[PDB]
Design a protein around this ligand. Structure first.
Ligand SMILES: [Zn+2]
Lengths: 87, 69
């Protein structure tokens, strides 16, 4: 429901199967919400502000780090117990 | 030491307890009392405290993340 043009517009509704991963509360007054600040996505609940701690996720960049992450995702390099990499 | 239950205060002096200090504060809201140490050598064990002052206004989200960090 939240697209690239409407990521921060629609508050995100979560499930109550498990308590909140940020504050261990079973149920919360209002659904969560995403906001953008200085290239960082802040995730926080609405209504009671002190109920949920604010989480931060950075969209850093550094193309070479992204390439390294993608090459790791394919799972082609491994570290053997002897300490030598296998590819 | 086993802790201390006596609070020494200065009016700009007294030695009051928790109930005594609560009652005095309730009676006089405008009284200016500063909590200090009755004897530095005797009960030098105290809590850990800090005072923070920033002459600006912040919203709820910024204040929350800043206080966490
Ligand atoms: Zn929560």
């Amino acid at each position: 429901d939240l697209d690239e043009n409407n990521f921060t517009t629609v508050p995100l509704v979560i499930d109550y199967v498990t308590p909140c991963a940020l504050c261990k509360k079973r149920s919360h007054k209002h659904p969560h919400q995403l906001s953008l600040e200085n290239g960082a996505i802040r995730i926080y609940k609405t209504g009671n502000p002190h109920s949920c701690k604010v989480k931060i996720v950075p969209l850093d960049g550094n193309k070479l780090f992204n390439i390294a992450q993608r090459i790791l995702d394919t799972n082609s390099v491994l570290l053997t117990e002897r300490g030598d990499h296998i590819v | 030491i086993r802790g201390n239950d006596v609070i020494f205060v200065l009016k700009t002096v007294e030695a009051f307890k928790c109930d005594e200090l609560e009652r005095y504060i309730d009676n006089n809201p405008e009284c200016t009392l500063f909590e200090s140490l009755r004897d530095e050598e005797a009960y030098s064990i105290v809590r850990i405290f800090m005072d923070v002052d920033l002459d600006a206004c912040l919203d709820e989200i910024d204040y929350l993340t800043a206080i966490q960090d």
